[PDB]
Amino acid sequence: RFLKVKNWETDVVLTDTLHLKSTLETGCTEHICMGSIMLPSVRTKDQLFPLAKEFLDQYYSSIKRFGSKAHMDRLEEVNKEIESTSTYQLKDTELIYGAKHAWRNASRCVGRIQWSKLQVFDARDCTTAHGMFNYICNHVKYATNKGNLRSAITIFPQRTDGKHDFRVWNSQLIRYAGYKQPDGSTLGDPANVQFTEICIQQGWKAPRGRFDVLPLLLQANGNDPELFQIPPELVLEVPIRHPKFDWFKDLGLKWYGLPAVSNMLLEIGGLEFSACPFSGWYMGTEIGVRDYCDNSRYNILEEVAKKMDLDMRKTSSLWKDQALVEINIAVLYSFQSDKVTIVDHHSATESFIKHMENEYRCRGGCPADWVWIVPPMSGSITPVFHQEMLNYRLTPSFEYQPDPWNTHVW
Amino acid sequence: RFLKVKNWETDVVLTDTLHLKSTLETGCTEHICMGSIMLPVRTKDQLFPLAKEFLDQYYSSIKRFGSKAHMDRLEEVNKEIESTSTYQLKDTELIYGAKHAWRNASRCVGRIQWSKLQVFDARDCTTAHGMFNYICNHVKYATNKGNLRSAITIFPQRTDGKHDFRVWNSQLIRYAGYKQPDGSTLGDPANVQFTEICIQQGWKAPRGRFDVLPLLLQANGNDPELFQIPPELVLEVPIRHPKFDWFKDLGLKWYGLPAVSNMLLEIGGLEFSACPFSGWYMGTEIGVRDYCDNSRYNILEEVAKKMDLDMRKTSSLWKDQALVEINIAVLYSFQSDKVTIVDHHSATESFIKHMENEYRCRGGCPADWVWIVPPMSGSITPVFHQEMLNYRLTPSFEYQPDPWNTHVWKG
Numbered sequence A: 001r002f003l004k005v006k007n008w009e010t011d012v013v014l015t016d017t018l019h020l021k022s023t024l025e026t027g028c029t030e031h032i033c034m035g036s037i038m039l040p041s042v043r044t045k046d047q048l049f050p051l052a053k054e055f056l057d058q059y060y061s062s063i064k065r066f067g068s069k070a071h072m073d074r075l076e077e078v079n080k081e082i083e084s085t086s087t088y089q090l091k092d093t094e095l096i097y098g099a100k101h102a103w104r105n106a107s108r109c110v111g112r113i114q115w116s117k118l119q120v121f122d123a124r125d126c127t128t129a130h131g132m133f134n135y136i137c138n139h140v141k142y143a144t145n146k147g148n149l150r151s152a153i154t155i156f157p158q159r160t161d162g163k164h165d166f167r168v169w170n171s172q173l174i175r176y177a178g179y180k181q182p183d184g185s186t187l188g189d190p191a192n193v194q195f196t197e198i199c200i201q202q203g204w205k206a207p208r209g210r211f212d213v214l215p216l217l218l219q220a221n222g223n224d225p226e227l228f229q230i231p232p233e234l235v236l237e238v239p240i241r242h243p244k245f246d247w248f249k250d251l252g253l254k255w256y257g258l259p260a261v262s263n264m265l266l267e268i269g270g271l272e273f274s275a276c277p278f279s280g281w282y283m284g285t286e287i288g289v290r291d292y293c294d295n296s297r298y299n300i301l302e303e304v305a306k307k308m309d310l311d312m313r314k315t316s317s318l319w320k321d322q323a324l325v326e327i328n329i330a331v332l333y334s335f336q337s338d339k340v341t342i343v344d345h346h347s348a349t350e351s352f353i354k355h356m357e358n359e360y361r362c363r364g365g366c367p368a369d370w371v372w373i374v375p376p377m378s379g380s381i382t383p384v385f386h387q388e389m390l391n392y393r394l395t396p397s398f399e400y401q402p403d404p405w406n407t408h409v410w
Numbered sequence B: 001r002f003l004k005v006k007n008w009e010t011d012v013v014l015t016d017t018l019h020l021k022s023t024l025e026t027g028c029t030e031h032i033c034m035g036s037i038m039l040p041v042r043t044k045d046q047l048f049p050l051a052k053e054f055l056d057q058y059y060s061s062i063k064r065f066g067s068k069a070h071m072d073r074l075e076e077v078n079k080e081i082e083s084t085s086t087y088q089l090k091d092t093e094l095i096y097g098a099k100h101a102w103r104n105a106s107r108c109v110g111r112i113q114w115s116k117l118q119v120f121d122a123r124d125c126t127t128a129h130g131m132f133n134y135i136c137n138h139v140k141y142a143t144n145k146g147n148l149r150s151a152i153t154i155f156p157q158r159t160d161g162k163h164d165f166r167v168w169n170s171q172l173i174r175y176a177g178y179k180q181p182d183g184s185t186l187g188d189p190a191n192v193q194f195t196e197i198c199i200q201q202g203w204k205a206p207r208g209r210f211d212v213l214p215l216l217l218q219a220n221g222n223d224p225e226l227f228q229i230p231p232e233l234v235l236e237v238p239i240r241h242p243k244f245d246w247f248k249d250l251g252l253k254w255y256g257l258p259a260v261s262n263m264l265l266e267i268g269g270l271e272f273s274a275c276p277f278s279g280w281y282m283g284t285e286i287g288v289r290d291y292c293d294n295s296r297y298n299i300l301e302e303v304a305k306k307m308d309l310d311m312r313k314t315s316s317l318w319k320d321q322a323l324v325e326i327n328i329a330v331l332y333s334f335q336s337d338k339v340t341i342v343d344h345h346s347a348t349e350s351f352i353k354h355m356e357n358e359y360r361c362r363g364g365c366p367a368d369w370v371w372i373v374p375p376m377s378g379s380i381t382p383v384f385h386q387e388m389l390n391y392r393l394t395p396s397f398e399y400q401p402d403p404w405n406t407h408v409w410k411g
């Protein structure tokens, strides 16, 4: 009930008491652990007020005014607003707090040492998809900051009846298109083949290239989604070169500077924000390990190993492993050269350990998903590999939600 | 009930029904996942249900469920439990049980081999000297001059918990570690405490970097006794690199035979507290964990020095670069000496094929993603992208306390 986590590299033991404030399910039971499952598969008036109460209780505790004059008045005011309107509206201060804590609670995020520095853009006055586009251009420009990346979230109006949802149809604000070739192969990003089709079906003029920045597909107020092209000059991209292999340029690789997730749902006080794009800066392995080397993505390992003249006949030569390191050297080198913020997996995981220790000391815990926190290369030489972690669900939270094309009454 | 796991690289979806036959706890609840946490005698009372469940599984596997042989055995074991408070396994049941404890080991990526286990029945052993003889023969058999063969040796089961057989070594073959007065460590830092016990028990330590530890063996709850494995039985591989001539001068070697000796084997409710088992290494166990953990031999710096990598900031990935070269040299060295070893690419590919086969023919394959995924290059192996369900099936291998923490010394 007062659980312990151990670091097996340093023998440091921390005691977790924050998990007793956990709420929703993990997907696990005493009979089966689902820790490696990627996704374990509107609010009536009752459901809504305790969620509001739990949130306002922790907000007012955080500002040292729990059980106080303003606390009771706010609880009473929101109660009245729910009885009347069957929902309520957050004060600006509560919305900023809720968003920073949604990030703080993201158990799959290794970069949470930064959680308190989030720039929150209140877009709750937006009414149309052209407005959403304007809000998102300003987000992209603020966050990019000429390569000195700054964390940001832009929060569009909350769900109401459920038929008037705001949605960003793109999974991320900035991603490359994917096209099926006539000969059967795939050009561009194979992960984005279906979404690219909906872009064309809704009218996109695809330039069928390999690194075509997809257009935004924005849905305001439950209406039909509309296409917009992000101003090219707002999309910072990095050509990938290697500090040793001059032939690395001829691979033609590039990637964008801004990781910006736009398909998640932000829950604060029982209220649901279905369109809440947020951005930070990349950890190098996201690009070089997953984006470039997954067999289901750009899958460049075999090409890179051939230019390195490695023995690709036997897996035990570790040729895949060697090329993988070099690819990830080049990504870091490229971003660092062009002065685009990026963090390597050693720096990011060391920061998370210090963040964990801070959260245990000052908060009593830190929910953490080891399966996602440990980087996809060189796992055991990063400090998080040796760190036991407890995973549990705290609110405010970012949650997955269904892809809108499977939901939208067109 | 059904449960589905997906492979996110291939979109293959498998359906788990075997989890319905799971038993003990995972440590998780609907409110917390303990999937990354490393760790967690019987009466006649709870024992016959455990025996019956096991015998039902045994007789089902041989297509004899409900047979007269099945019903007779259940009656026989029932009466033996009522009159003696325990029971003895037949040889055939012991072999079946040991194979299935391996098959059920959710942290083991090498389980494609589970049906080819050599089982050595040491239940007639009575003294530590007899344990030593059995373990030497296991080491010789399993080593097989480098053509390694999986084996397990099973010593007498627990009775009242005051007469346990135990192998005090966590593994049959391991190198000593010695803490120096200046705070540095010579040899394997993970073995400092066990080395100190051996020294206190009378072991004369060579005090080198790669000294094979002696066996410390406990029979029938008596005080443990020290034994030196004959050095001609301990096969070792000097580590060199196929391109770097200077690698041999690091002075590294490793033993060929991985043999776990601190775990408890549970079959049909019986507890075998001494059951050493051995297979062959996956390269990353040595080259990633043994050599490169900060808490182990920790050679990343030396190797990176001699490669003349840019060591000033971590974003040069000098650690990742040195890590790959070390694991190449381990694989190269074992293969050149014709000692069995498997790289993490081959091992994870085989495990996926094993897992898919188990879902087909058995309805599932319990698997611990946190342990299955190798400690380098995780996502370029196919297990990274495979969803896995973790649950406990018996027969099983379990952790048990270290004996020096529980042993009542005789003096």
Ligand code: HEM
Pocket: A103, A106, A108, A109, A110, A111, A112, A114, A118, A151, A152, A153, A278, A279, A280, A281, A282, A283, A286, A343, A348, A372, A398
């Ligand atoms: C500032 C630098 C940041 C770094 C270095 C970072 C790092 C990461 C990484 C490596 C992942 C794994 C993603 C994947 O493997 O697909 C992740 C996941 C995640 N991050 Fe962070 N992140 C940062 C900022 C943020 C911000 C600003 C937010 C929210 C305001 C956030 C929320 C999340 C969430 C919810 C996930 C889980 C995503 C999912 O389930 O797909 N991150 N982060």
Ligand code: HEM
Pocket: B102, B105, B107, B108, B109, B110, B111, B113, B117, B150, B151, B152, B277, B278, B279, B280, B281, B282, B285, B342, B347, B371, B397
């Ligand atoms: C035949 C070749 C084998 C290979 C390649 C193999 C591979 C592995 C590896 C790499 C690990 C993780 C070790 C660690 O990280 O400490 C492991 C764990 C394990 N293996 Fe296998 N293994 C083999 C044979 C066996 C056999 C013969 C048994 C039992 C009869 C077995 C049972 C287990 C168990 C119980 C674990 C979990 C150990 C723990 O919790 O510390 N393995 N295996």
Ligand SMILES: Cc1cc(N)nc(CCc2cc(CCN)cc(F)c2F)c1
Pocket: A172, A174, A175, A258, A259, A260, A261, A278, A279, A280, A281, A282, A283, A286
């Ligand atoms: C805020 C943030 C920071 C960061 N460092 N990383 C991310 C994830 C980014 C991301 C993930 C995926 C796949 C998610 N399953 C595809 C993308 F195009 C993308 F940008 C988000």
Ligand SMILES: Cc1cc(N)nc(CCc2cc(CCN)cc(F)c2F)c1
Pocket: B110, B171, B173, B174, B257, B258, B259, B260, B277, B278, B279, B280, B281, B282, B285
């Ligand atoms: C049967 C078997 C096969 C294999 N391929 N691997 C193992 C693990 C072997 C092992 C693990 C550890 C660390 C345990 N946490 C230390 C050792 F000395 C050792 F031999 C066992």
Ligand SMILES: C[C@H](O)[C@H](O)[C@H]1CNc2nc(N)[nH]c(=O)c2N1
Pocket: A008, A385, A386, A387, A388, A389, B036, B037, B038, B370, B371, B372
């Ligand atoms: C804390 C974490 O569970 C611990 O470091 C685990 C992670 N995964 C592992 N995986 C394997 N194969 N072996 C290990 O010892 C560990 N250690």
Ligand SMILES: C[C@H](O)[C@H](O)[C@H]1CNc2nc(N)[nH]c(=O)c2N1
Pocket: A036, A037, A038, A371, A372, A373, B008, B384, B385, B386, B387, B388
């Ligand atoms: C099946 C498995 O859970 C899946 O491949 C996960 C593993 N860990 C991950 N970790 C991160 N950071 N991102 C991912 O997409 C995944 N994918």
Ligand SMILES: [Zn+2]
Pocket: A028, A029, A032, A033, A034, A035, B028, B032, B033, B034, B035
């Ligand atoms: Zn779990």
